[PDB]
């Protein structure tokens, strides 16, 4: 980013993200039928789209349970936002997975992220990210956890859901190179999975304890090994004042400017 | 006749206060016109003082009354005019008007008018006791207000009376200015503050208002003064309580018109003095310039300045008023460089080289301003901008005459007072950002600055020189000699004025509107000069009173307000209705075009980017435009702003936006035009942004109310949030702040660090302590929440706010304001919000707020409870409330349908003797009764009947009683009600119903065990309250009279829900246990209001579902119309006061001719509200409308009265009922009401239960009440409210019954939900538990832990626990869940009971009562009480100790604390035999100690606390005996 002009164009843009919110598409494609099927409550989806930005990827972590007596469907009941920052093609979020009390009741279902340009494939950066989570986390089950990619289409939003195949998981555990075309990448690595939106139940948010989630505007304050706690509260928007301290901390001024126009007229209170 | 719409545009006066209504002017005597090239110059000489009249002398400060003389020190004699009117000043309440020239010293006249009132309240042994009166001084200018409070303070300080400026934001300083008298303010301030109601707590304590410089009537600001005074007068006509009004004006014609306006009797009240009375005679010079081209003009005026100034260059003094900031010093240095260009001519401003102190001007050398250049020479400059102290240092220099040339601004004339030998006004034109252009300065500005001409002391006569444009030259003559009419600009503002009056409720309809306008200055002007105001004389003759013009006028205002949605007013009725938009508009003094712009523009989804634009579109800014020259700088500013404007290009929107940002971002601007503009924008911005916040918050749209309150704060504080909060403490160094901003270390992480750890971050350790202070000065709340589900739809939230910050009144001041708002799952919708205000006293005291919130069908992961300071920026705390574990209650089955039955005649029961006690009362039983009948009467089984209060369940009980009557001669029946009042109320009926007609003996239980025992068993029907029937019947095993009862009746069982409910629950349960052991069935009949969970109650009390009748509140014999009225004023006094008028209106609307009961929060409030009902009764022009008999008939009743005011209120048909009234007085009032003599009775809330007289309309006023113990208000218990509502029932006659409940904003939704639906009821036994286990263990009903659990299973708690487990903090609905829960329960109850030595627990299994518990159980005393006794009473204790030990008893904490009982009990405690060790006077134990000693000393107290004393004494002996034991 240009860090001056580049900030503002996208900033007055993102104030319209809520317009997208009511036009969304969902990939319908061939159902494995032996697979799990994930239901995403619409409210969290709306809010998640609304906090995002149209260039930097933001990501969120999925937490849910399967409804009683129906083990093959996973309701996503919660999204957790952790300290993070994006690129246009990927997202850097820390090594620690969410730990918190409200979360103990549910299982992790993977993660969801915004995708500035729509691609009909799981980006190598993603399969690599996911495998590398999975390597370090037994908590995440290969077969149960997914990557939901939410892409910004014109005036719209459109989303797909992927699972790593074991081929993919091994490649990704192995993979170093984060470029858009790493060696040995294959369409054999991922698999699409069945997902539905729902108005039947409401999902909720988990959000960083002492800060907010969006570190894009401080990259030096973000570290892979950084630790965080959580709370029950909603995410602030991308360009929200808090995510942007450096800019509100731009004041170089001498007080005596106030000497000029010392006619104080007030008369009201 | 029907009204017609007119155009208010061509009907106003543009360029107001420059108006010049007369087109002809006059010479003075020796005046001449001499025209030069390019400029006409007019000269008038000084006036000739009127020769002293025969035997007319000045008054010294001696010969005027003794008291007032104080504070006049330094002044030996009164001014001629002061001396003229002092008599009427101090000897009459007649209103005043004086017209006297500038310099006559008008203030000291008005001062006397104040010293009279200050004297009206005086005592011998104390002076000027200050809570009787307050005075309001309205002055036109701010500087003038400041300086006036400054000197008034000094002067009046001898009296010790506290006078202050009213700059207060409404809420933080009200309770501050509560203690303030003689408050000074600008008319505007008074108008907003009255529109909000900050005044309505002050008024009626106001006997005097001063209008100073009332000629401001002619200014655009005029309508405000017109609005003030009109309101004051129109109000006095309603209240009949009068006020003095003292007007002060410059000398101008239309004096008699202003007189009419102020209701000044021209005879004794009018005072006029012409321009000859100016203390320093004024020679007037006026030079108008004919030059059209401005380029040549800006030379000509320079040169006129030079010649005029060189004229006085000898021994004399000149003062130049320029209207520019910078040009104060641009005008100087022109004179200087000219004097240098003069070949050193004009110089030597002294008597010599060294003479006249040139070393004075040289030795003062180094100064803050540009003075260093000018000071070595003869002249200098003055203004507010460049310096603070050096202004005072220049004023000192001018007074002592070391500078004979001073160029300055109007704020110098309006500020601290110094004159000049001759003053010169350069140009008269100023820049008006409000008007968007340049315009000639106001009347008061010149009048003030030219009234500075000449000294009172060092001068002979003053001169003044006004350099203006020739075209305005006529105008400025019509002023400074009295030619100018004072006219009203009121028409321009008429739509805005009307709104605010509807908003205050002072105008309901068109008629009240014309009545109001009939009090305006514009009215008398339209009367006496119709020709000017747009009325031809012929149609004036056609309508002499202007009824049809005042009807046409205001009709257009009504239409404008309707079209912008400020008011809903239909032409047919002529009535107005206020909308919240209207209120917001009035409260912020924002125009009605701006507000509709906001209505259409504002949507939930608005970004900051857009919020600013909407702000920029405010109609208040309509004339602001963007100039070519400044579009160069605006672009730079546009790229240096944080919030993108880029939606807009260069147009007014952009200019205003970038300006607001510039101000917040704190940016200095090169152009002067832009500076003034920016100032305008930002000053109006506070009110504007705030009205936005209020609107958008009332809508409930969370995100935008955040963005808008934050904007408000950013405007107030002049910074963005991205800057360190420490900046709001201005006490802090800038470099330190910038330093902590340098390193990014999130602010809330400063609390973890100590004084040293702080300084280590910025490597400035010397600061380490001071920083720390501020970090802990910054307001911080921590908050906890206790949440329990009520119904599947609603949860209850108890928020506990604990102050985490150190209070300093030099920072936080008297009060700190916080919004608490609970937001939904996405932080999208605001489900609920309250305004919470923590006062000074109560920092560190945790406050408890209780409120309900709804839940919805996709049950969400959590809500959020947000709390944010109003004024404080970056100060917020959020609290996730997680539902992850929430278990919602089982949805409630539909109420049993009301069957359609042939209404049962009394002829049903074949018993004639029974028929007799009904037939002559009502012909038919109601559908409820007739549906219950066969089950309750012809059949023997337990029934439950819920129906909402007013359904007639009492005779449903009487059915069962009659059945038992047939069953056996001696048949025994016990009847229970939770309210003792209700019990006596039942007894009075049933004693005649049964004992009188049916010969069957009827009794009513009492305190004493013995007498009570004897009572039952002689009686067939035993009426009692749960506590009386607990103590007796705990021992039931031994008392055969308990066991042998045939029937058992529980009335109002839903009351289980409330406190003193557990005892009810426990006695019904016990009753069942007895029927278990007695082997005979004991029929139980329970009666409740509509109950959602009635099933549980029935299952508990053993009713088959077939005999269970639970009815919906919509089933009532007489239908009810319920209305709820929300009031947004949180401060309870103001709220309670502002619902006064609505009460009257609620009567006139809902029940004009029918009986009306009004319930009130306070014992005393009943009087006051009866009064107010009568005083606003006069308003209607309708007097004594509520009295239905002649005064001759009421005399026999009034002979029995003590209370004198009650006589009055009764005389007009009202009357009241409360604690203090003698039972005869009460009986009388009740009689008068029911008989139909008086149509309205105001009653204390306490009397809702025990009142035997019903009504048609019931109005509940303000559902909160005051509790001294936590020092806060607390809501009416819901069942109470339902009872008050049920008090509107009149089945005999009315086809309907009506209720209006006026309550706070917060409490609105709660009533909307729970008054209509059937009610849920939960058990409280889990909390109040020990006492009963103890007592029961004593009877050996619980022999061991097992028996304890078993006992638990007989309760209603047992029933409910699995129904709504989250309420009882039971975490699962399972079997072992409930089992483990009850287990843990008896476990800890028995443990706590064993710790207290009331029982002994053997083997861990068995239990036995011990000494303590035995005592407790015997005397029916709380167990903690006698434990306290156990650790308190020692070997050496005596009556001194026994008093306090017996006082701390638990049964004495039921004793409450009333409004300001902290001083009362202190005054009593002073004079009692035994003093106390640092007693807190809000504590009921202390109060009972003091009341007890008072009783021992036979001191007669007020009946208020005497009642209390009696109640203490009632239960005293038992406690005493327990101590003996």
UniProtKB/Swiss-Prot annotation, chain A:
Residues 37-168 form the MPN domain. Residues 235-269 are annotated as: Required for interaction with EFTUD2 and SNRNP200. Widely expressed. Changing residue 243 to P: In RP13; no effect on interaction with SNRNP200 and EFTUD2. It is found in: Nucleus; Nucleus speckle. Changing residue 243 to R: In RP13; no effect on interaction with SNRNP200 and EFTUD2. Part of the U5 snRNP complex. Component of the U4/U6-U5 tri-snRNP complex composed of the U4, U6 and U5 snRNAs and at least PRPF3, PRPF4, PRPF6, PRPF8, PRPF31, SNRNP200, TXNL4A, SNRNP40, DDX23, CD2BP2, PPIH, SNU13, EFTUD2, SART1 and USP39. Component of the U5.U4atac/U6atac snRNP complexes in U12-dependent spliceosomes. Within the minor spliceosome, which acts on U12-type introns, interacts with PPIL2 and RBM48. Core component of U2-type precatalytic, catalytic and postcatalytic spliceosomal complexes. Found in a mRNA splicing-dependent exon junction complex (EJC) with SRRM1. It is linked to Retinitis pigmentosa 13: A retinal dystrophy belonging to the group of pigmentary retinopathies. Retinitis pigmentosa is characterized by retinal pigment deposits visible on fundus examination and primary loss of rod photoreceptor cells followed by secondary loss of cone photoreceptors. Patients typically have night vision blindness and loss of midperipheral visual field. As their condition progresses, they lose their far peripheral visual field and eventually central vision as well. Plays a role in pre-mRNA splicing as core component of precatalytic, catalytic and postcatalytic spliceosomal complexes, both of the predominant U2-type spliceosome and the minor U12-type spliceosome. Functions as a scaffold that mediates the ordered assembly of spliceosomal proteins and snRNAs. Required for the assembly of the U4/U6-U5 tri-snRNP complex, a building block of the spliceosome. Functions as a scaffold that positions spliceosomal U2, U5 and U6 snRNAs at splice sites on pre-mRNA substrates, so that splicing can occur. Interacts with both the 5' and the 3' splice site. The MPN (JAB/Mov34) domain mediates interaction with TSSC4 and SNRNP200. Has structural similarity with deubiquitinating enzymes, but lacks the residues that would bind the catalytic metal ion. This is Pre-mRNA-processing-splicing factor 8. The lineage of its organism: Eukaryota, Metazoa, Chordata, Craniata, Vertebrata.
From Swiss-Prot, chain B:
Residues 578-883 form the SEC63 domain. Its main location: nucleus. The keyword Hydrolase applies. Residues 281-518, 1142-1350 form the Helicase C-terminal domain. The modification Phosphothreonine is found at residues 1025, 1362. It catalyses: ATP + H2O = ADP + phosphate + H(+). Changing residue 280 to L: In RP33; uncertain significance. Residues 1-1525 are annotated as: Interaction with C9orf78 and WBP4. The modification Phosphotyrosine is found at residue 306. The modification N6-acetyllysine is found at residue 568. Changing residue 1145 to A: Strongly decreases ATP-dependent RNA helicase activity. Disulfide bonds: none annotated. Widely expressed. It is found in: Nucleus. The keyword Phosphoprotein applies. Keywords: Acetylation, ATP-binding, Coiled coil, Disease variant, Helicase, Hydrolase, Isopeptide bond, mRNA processing, mRNA splicing, Nucleotide-binding, Nucleus, Phosphoprotein, Repeat, Retinitis pigmentosa, Spliceosome, Ubl conjugation. Catalyzes the ATP-dependent unwinding of U4/U6 RNA duplices, an essential step in the assembly of a catalytically active spliceosome. Plays a role in pre-mRNA splicing as a core component of precatalytic, catalytic and postcatalytic spliceosomal complexes. As a component of the minor spliceosome, involved in the splicing of U12-type introns in pre-mRNAs. Involved in spliceosome assembly, activation and disassembly. Mediates changes in the dynamic network of RNA-RNA interactions in the spliceosome. Belongs to the helicase family. SKI2 subfamily. Contains two helicase domains. The N-terminal helicase domain has catalytic activity by itself, contrary to the C-terminal helicase domain that may have a regulatory role and enhance the activity of the first helicase domain. Component of a core complex containing at least PRPF8, SNRNP200, EFTUD2 and SNRNP40. Component of the U5 snRNP and U4/U6-U5 tri-snRNP complexes, building blocks of the spliceosome. Component of the U4/U6-U5 tri-snRNP complex composed of the U4, U6 and U5 snRNAs and at least PRPF3, PRPF4, PRPF6, PRPF8, PRPF31, SNRNP200, TXNL4A, SNRNP40, DDX23, CD2BP2, PPIH, SNU13, EFTUD2, SART1 and USP39. Component of precatalytic, catalytic and postcatalytic spliceosomal complexes. Component of the minor spliceosome, which splices U12-type introns. It is linked to Retinitis pigmentosa 33: A retinal dystrophy belonging to the group of pigmentary retinopathies. Retinitis pigmentosa is characterized by retinal pigment deposits visible on fundus examination and primary loss of rod photoreceptor cells followed by secondary loss of cone photoreceptors. Patients typically have night vision blindness and loss of midperipheral visual field. As their condition progresses, they lose their far peripheral visual field and eventually central vision as well. This is U5 small nuclear ribonucleoprotein 200 kDa helicase. It comes from Homo sapiens (Human). The chain holds residues 404 to 1928 of 2136 of the full protein.
